[PDB]
Symmetry: D2
Subunit: 212 residues, 4 copies
């Protein structure tokens, strides 16, 4: 596909919606805010809307390389703060994916340029879980690191001042850690779901334990 | 929709693909890299794949509040550098949208919290184009600011060291500035398309002139 | 000077303080917090303590290339928020300097690498004030840009959510914009001093007017 | 001290230099670049020039809360890249300090606001070294964490793409990790000095071993 194809396809799709789904934009024109924030990877191998059935307007989205929530990344933190404090999303889903190019590059460590600095945060997680990974068969280690990465980003998200403040004041927000692969598109819930500061810690340990 | 609904819908969708599109993941399993990078807004009012017909695996994606390319945002710059230098995408599309909550908040300036710092970059663009906006009817000013924001982010992207280096070395990368609204989902090409350092400047001025 | 010289000089200086100034560390050992935050340039051509006579413990310090307060730089914003909310500094001084290598590189635009992205924020200010600079003799333009840069960083600092919140709640914090050169080390007050949201705007315009 | 005092002291100091040290600015007026980059804490309890005897023009400086080199902090990375690639500094010194308010806040974890996000990077280091710290007497743990923080920031600096590139191309740059306290101002060399990729790893382990 080329650029002229995208523009032309868009024009035809917009016209065909009049017959196929004349109401396609009706919920978007209402003041209903999205209830979900999705933090995923720029690889976007299967779009979040396809994976879940979520409709236009139901999902606020951030994507970056390897779906990180770095403690001091103001881009992601600004998405989160707007979603939690202004849109009042009820769920935040961090979704990783098996085969992620960012996770693979963190492990193989090729000299890729500027991106290698971003990927050092993944190498820190790999270091953190070296003993756990060493108890597992080698062929499962890379996908396990993909899962651990998600769990650590959920943990970071729950430790941000944004989430700590929301939970302290009794706002209902739940964080989830998921992963999928392109072998079937099937979401795996990594079982780290957090609804407050206490469950954040308990279920982080639970998710890691399920891997041990 | 609730969380159990998303998980259950995903499981049913994955199973139904066997009959509907057993080859759905086949291109994803190949080593073909995406040819397009989409930088859009976290509002994600209509997903980029729906707007354009792009299939899974064809698009690398970054989203942040109001689709900014801030000169010093390492999150977006890391997506861009990986896309340009490692994946060798041929097109980068920055897409804004009429009615964007981030653009509207920049103009109305409510006290929203942390996000207001991010939005100051939009207020700088609004200031930059005050005289242009003053020559236009008031009712068209907010959507014109949405377009100017896209054009300025294209300009910032082309001035990044990543893009300047790629163009200097003769890598073929084209940057585009688009917008759409939810009244019809129809993409408007803002006509700032840049294939090198010279067209970046020429077509930036062209796009602004088309508004004057 | 070499590394062994620094270590050896430090050991001799520490010993000599017993006779010269046995009380040198006494105020540092007290709980008195610094009353001033200095945001300056990494060039650090004359140290802030030498310029002003401020003693150890009186100054909290941030330095970066060309003394910027970028709207979305969490490093500088974190220094500011800790200084304002935790240390309760009463004064923030942004100090630029004539001959700054960062300002000069923004104007000459050599291909320096990663730093060029940071310097684009200065090029934006240069663009903003093109008409003002054009009314002045060429030989004064670079130093005038140095001053305008300081004034714009003061303006950015006052527009941060940190400062807006502090002023809204009645905390006494004053922001100042200064510059000096190495021809005499003499500080010039650029006359943009702000004690609240209103004086921020009034004195920003005043400082610019003093240049016109 | 108040603001009028600083301005007045500066004017008197500038005049008195004519008799005391008429050549004070002479090296600054030459094209000699600084040979040292100092990365220190915004606490700046004893200024680096006082600790070492370094003269004006000999030191390029960055300061942030708790002297961090975060993998993805473009402010510090931009200082480093300009210092290494443009100024060609020969030494980078990361200096922490015993009693640092940032390190103490990471351990005590008060609710301080925005700064808590920055401090999570220190809490990650505290977690990393929990077993080491547990083998030591409690009263020495906080200062040991101050030292470990410096060592980890040296390690991060050496793993940045900036430093890896410089060492790969044979540029002579040495990184050092130091600390001091206000009980005597005496620098402690933490013995993690790195001149290439190999010594970075060897001396990181050496410095940690010296603590065990
Ligand atoms: Zn990925
Ligand atoms: Zn938007
Ligand atoms: Zn400077
Ligand atoms: Zn400190």
């Amino acid at each position: 596909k080329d650029i002229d194809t995208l523009i032309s396809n868009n024009a035809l799709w917009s016209k065909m919606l009049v017959e196929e789904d004349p109401g396609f934009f009706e919920k978007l024109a209402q003041a209903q805010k999205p209830r979900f924030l999705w933090i995923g990877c720029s690889d976007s191998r299967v779009p979040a809307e396809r994976l879940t059935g979520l409709e236009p307007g139901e999902l606020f989205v951030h994507r970056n390389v390897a779906n990180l929530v770095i403690h001091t990344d103001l881009n992601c933190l600004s998405v989160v703060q707007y979603a939690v404090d202004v849109l009042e999303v009820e769920h935040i889903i961090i979704c990783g994916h098996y085969g992620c190019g960012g996770v693979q590059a963190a492990v193989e460590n090729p000299e890729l340029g500027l991106i290698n600095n971003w990927l050092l945060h993944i190498r820190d997680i790999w270091f953190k879980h070296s003993s756990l990974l060493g108890e597992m068969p080698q062929e499962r280690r890379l996908d396990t690191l993909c899962e651990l990465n998600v769990m650590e980003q959920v943990y970071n998200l729950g430790h941000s001042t944004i989430m700590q403040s929301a939970w302290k004041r009794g706002q209902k927000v739940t964080i989830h850690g998921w992963a999928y692969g392109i072998h079937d598109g099937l979401l795996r819930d990594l079982d780290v779901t957090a609804t407050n500061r206490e469950t954040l810690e308990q279920r982080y340990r639970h998710g890691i334990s399920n891997l041990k």
